[PDB]
Design a protein around this ligand. Structure first.
Ligand SMILES: C=CC(=O)NCCc1ccc(Cl)c(Oc2cc(Cl)cc(C#N)c2)c1
Lengths: 532, 402
């Protein structure tokens, strides 16, 4: 029966680089005997072919005993050729996520590992795969071989193989839309919702279709252990995970981030190691003690995503289609920065969940968010940046995201007007902060270990502390404006946090800016006082 | 029929840009589109030997419901060898219409050795299958070499119309043809329908005009009663404009703010102060001194969100040297979507930039990177894409353009 050929994939070396010319390592007589036996069988199977003296390239071959079974295993170390071989479009960068898989009634496995040695190597490239079995006692020329098929451990083998299998399976998958085929390791996974009879029949058709390219199938069992998951017919979950004054070695565990995808409420904010380190002040989540599974995707039901604020810049989310049955979960950590607020972080979580959902299900989910519609509207209509979150509804699960203060757009009538300024000496780190008001109120406070920026903030704090519920404040600090106009609700500077706490207590605050050193009367008087 | 040899610039490899996630509807549309382009020979499947990639996505152009394939050739265009004139009349014309002539490019073969760099990937949902990989056989839409290589054929097609109508200015940028006139729209569309007819006699079924001021004047309030706060805002605006205009003076106005006064209190202007304000008005009526366009330097576009659907913009090359300023007030698609408005503003500002200088500016967007990158493709309707960066600190200047 004629066999259709697998078309070769033209391979070249990187430009300007030539093939390998490595030295074959000295071997033991026992190892040489073992390698010669292997290569004769591989040669008898077409996987390698003996080459003459012309080939100047060589890759070292080693022999490793496989579990001391009284058997040896051939190992060709292509590391050098891989460095000199062209780049390929690898296709396995992204793994499917289980929550995106669709439930199937029947799922059969088939062994197609025999196809790897059934995939030819480009003729013009084989000479670069040459290797030498050393001769016993080095008294004869070593046996020379080259590869005819994709070698195990070569750069191109993973990409060329998958691209070859996909080209083979294309007619079958197109003409049988009632089935799905996924390729993992040396086995192919085929699923369908057909009757067990039709499913087994179509598997016979696939075995026949593979037989056309000569690939021959032999004559696991759920759950499948795959990429750190457990895949059951109705559910999926992560494979089991495991954790002393020795925790100092690493924070690579920690790996609860892997668990975070199904187990809710996992946190990794310990941020130790922000090769031996102390550890303290942490909580064992210990939610990993009880088993939690996820559901598969039903494209006829809506996708939902609910977000919760966990505190300390931590956010947790669940993505689900039916209440209390979660396809997957996860977390979001606030970005490193000096000032922030909850609305911005919830916005960033929304965007992260959006892109992840596009990846996994090909659509944006509907959001349920712990923020009032009125809160969000006030926010985006007055925020100086453009922002947007997709379709969403409020869920009353405290803690609720809110706006903690809002500055006035116009000066306040009948509210006292505070002109503030601050200054410091760069050399002495000494400065003053203070205010003068329209009612004659005044203050100047002397300060040590300060900068011009801190004095400008401290002056605003003083005016906020010593004013009524409604207050107008005039500063020349572009630095303070840039901070307060960004609407922070929390900060790393305790001085900003104190201003924030004063703003939360006020009823109305109007913050106006004037240029310095231009003769604005209130700013001029307070500048002379604080620059002394 | 004979391809033009094309090569990358010296010392640069082909593009290797990550394909970003796409919705199921955009993937399904891209499959139907590429399946048909394959049968027409415009594209062909490729193997793992090709490491290069350029992102692809889908849009719906203005006033149409049909998905269109858009390729983000920005990386390829940077590394594409500079291939070796701008009409100053196009901006001065009364009415300019924009025509998608990109399909014309698809009848010209692409240089054989260069096709590898046009590689693109149709992604799969959940990485469940491998990506469908293609490369171009004909001139690709969105590639900078496509108008360059096709220019020889384009002049030949258009010389008849140009001789018949010499007052019409015709300009080409990427897949777009810009056709200016000083006539009426009915006959303009008639001449436009005529141009399409030449194009049918080897193509697709935007109306725009210039505005009054290139650089919008800075204006100051005219009031009968000034509060302390009014005068503080004025002094702030004048101090800012003094970085652009030479003789701005604020001494006589700042002197009125003498003392520690309530912000809402009315302050009468002194005679010295009224004269100073009038002299500043006069100064602001004149043009900015020594403002030149340099084709070597990049153009920079800055956008401010002013609220209530209003947006301001300034195009410049050197700070405080504005080549054009403007204000966009209403975007029909989004009274509830800031990002759609911004995206339409970027497209309008880029179009104006193509008319005036024939090249796109670099934008400074008032948006967080992650929000913009998540959503702008949902509202993009142009066949080109400009460059952009992100402003994370609120400019104090938004007030001065309000
Ligand atoms: C028994 C579980 C079950 O049926 N789960 C439903 C989802 C499901 C559907 C179709 C197929 Cl083919 C499938 O098999 C896979 C997929 C993938 Cl990513 C990896 C592997 C492996 N190793 C098998 C799974």
């Amino acid at each position: 029966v004629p066999i259709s050929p697998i078309e070769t994939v033209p391979v070249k070396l990187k430009p300007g680089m030539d093939g390998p010319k490595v030295k074959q390592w000295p071997l033991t007589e026992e190892k040489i005997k073992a390698l010669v036996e292997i290569c004769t069988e591989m040669e008898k199977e077409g996987k390698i072919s003996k080459i003459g003296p012309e080939n100047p390239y060589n890759t070292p071959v080693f022999a490793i005993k496989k579990k001391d079974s009284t058997k040896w295993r051939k190992l060709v170390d292509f590391r050098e050729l891989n460095k000199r071989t062209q780049d390929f479009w690898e296709v396995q960068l992204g793994i499917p996520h289980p929550a995106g898989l669709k439930k199937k009634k029947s799922v059969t496995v088939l062994d197609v590992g025999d196809a790897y040695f059934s995939v030819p190597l480009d003729e013009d490239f084989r000479k670069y795969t040459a290797f030498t079995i050393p001769s016993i006692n080095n008294e004869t020329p070593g046996i020379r071989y080259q590869y005819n098929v994709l070698p195990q451990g070569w750069k191109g083998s993973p990409a060329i193989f998958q691209s070859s299998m996909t080209k083979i399976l294309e007619p079958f998958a197109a003409q049988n839309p009632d089935i799905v085929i996924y390729q993992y390791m040396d086995d192919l996974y085929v699923g369908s919702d057909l009757e067990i009879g039709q499913h087994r029949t179509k598997i016979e058709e696939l075995r026949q279709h593979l037989l056309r390219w000569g690939l021959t199938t032999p004559d696991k069992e759920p759950p499948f252990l795959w990429m750190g998951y457990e895949l059951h017919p109705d559910k999926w979950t992560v494979q089991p995970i495991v954790l002393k004054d020795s925790w100092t070695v690493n924070d690579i565990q920690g790996k609860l981030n892997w668990a975070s995808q199904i187990y809710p409420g996992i946190k990794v904010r310990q941020l130790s190691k922000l090769e031996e380190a102390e550890l303290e002040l942490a909580e064992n989540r210990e939610i990993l003690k009880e088993p939690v599974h996820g559901v598969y995707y039903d494209p006829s039901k809506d996708l939902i995503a609910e977000i919760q604020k966990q505190g300390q810049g931590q956010w947790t989310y669940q993505i689900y289609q039916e209440p209390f049955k979660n396809l997957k979960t996860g977390k979001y950590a606030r970005m490193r920065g000096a000032h922030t607020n909850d609305v911005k972080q919830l916005t960033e979580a929304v965007q992260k969940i959006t892109t992840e959902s596009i990846v996994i299900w090909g659509k944006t989910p509907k959001f349920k968010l712990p923020i009032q519609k009125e809160t969000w509207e006030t926010w985006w209509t007055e925020y100086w940046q453009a922002t947007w979150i997709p379709e969403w509804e409020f869920v009353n699960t405290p803690p609720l995201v809110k706006l903690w203060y809002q500055l006035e757009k116009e000066p306040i009538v009948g509210a006292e007007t505070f002109y503030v300024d601050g200054a410091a000496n760069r050399e002495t780190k000494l400065g003053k902060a203070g205010y003068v008001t329209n009612k004659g109120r005044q203050k100047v406070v002397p300060l040590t270990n300060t900068t011009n920026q801190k004095t400008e903030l401290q002056a605003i704090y003083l005016a906020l502390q010593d004013s009524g519920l409604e207050v107008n404040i005039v500063t020349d600090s572009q630095y303070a404006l840039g901070i307060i106009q960004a609407q922070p609700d929390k900060s790393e500077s305790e001085l900003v946090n104190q201003i924030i706490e004063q703003l939360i207590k006020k009823e109305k605050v109007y913050l106006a800016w004037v240029p310095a050193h231009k003769g604005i009367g209130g700013n001029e008087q307070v500048d002379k006082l604080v620059s002394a | 029929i004979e391809t033009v040899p094309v090569k990358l610039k010296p010392g640069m490899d082909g593009p290797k840009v990550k394909q970003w996630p796409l919705t199921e509807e955009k993937i399904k549309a891209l499959v139907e589109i590429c399946t048909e382009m394959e049968k027409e020979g415009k594209i062909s499947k490729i193997g793992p030997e090709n490491p290069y990639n350029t992102p692809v996505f889908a849009i719906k152009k203005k006033d149409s419901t049909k998905w269109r394939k858009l390729v983000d050739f920005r990386e390829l265009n940077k590394r594409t060898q500079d291939f070796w004139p701008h009409p100053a009349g196009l901006k001065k014309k009364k009415s300019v219409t924009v025509l998608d002539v990109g399909d014309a490019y698809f009848s010209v073969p692409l240089d054989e050795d260069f096709r590898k760099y046009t590689a693109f990937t149709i992604p799969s949902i959940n990485n469940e299958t491998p990506g469908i990989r293609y490369q171009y056989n004909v001139l690709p839409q969105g590639w900078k070499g496509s108008p360059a290589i096709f220019q020889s054929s384009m002049t030949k097609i258009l010389e008849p119309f140009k001789k018949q109508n010499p007052d019409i200015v015709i300009y080409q940028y990427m897949d777009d043809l810009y056709v200016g006139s000083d006539l009426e729209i009915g006959q303009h569309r008639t001449k436009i329908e005529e141009l399409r007819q030449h194009l049918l006699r080897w193509f697709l079924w935007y109306e725009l005009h210039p505005d009054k001021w290139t650089v919008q004047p800075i204006v100051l309030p005219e009031k009968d009663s000034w509060t302390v706060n009014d005068i503080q805002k004025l002094v702030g605006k004048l101090n800012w404009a003094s970085q652009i205009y030479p003789g701005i003076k604020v001494r006589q106005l700042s002197k009125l703010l003498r003392g520690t006064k309530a912000l809402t209190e009315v302050i009468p202007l002194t005679e010295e102060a009224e004269l100073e304000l009038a002299e500043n008005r006069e100064i602001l009526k004149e043009p900015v001194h020594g403002v030149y366009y340099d084709p070597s330097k990049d153009l920079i576009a800055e956008i401010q969100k002013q609220g209530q659907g209003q947006w301001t913009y300034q195009i410049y090359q050197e700070p405080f040297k504005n080549l054009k300023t403007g204000k966009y007030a209403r975007m029909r698609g989004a009274h509830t979507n800031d990002v759609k408005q911004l995206t339409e503003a970027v497209q309008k500002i880029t179009t104006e930039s193509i008319v005036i200088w024939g090249k796109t500016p670099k934008f400074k967007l008032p948006i967080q990177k992650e929000t913009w990158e998540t959503w702008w493709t949902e509202y993009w309707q142009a066949t080109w894409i400009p460059e952009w960066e992100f402003v994370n600190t609120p400019p104090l200047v938004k007030l001065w353009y309000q």
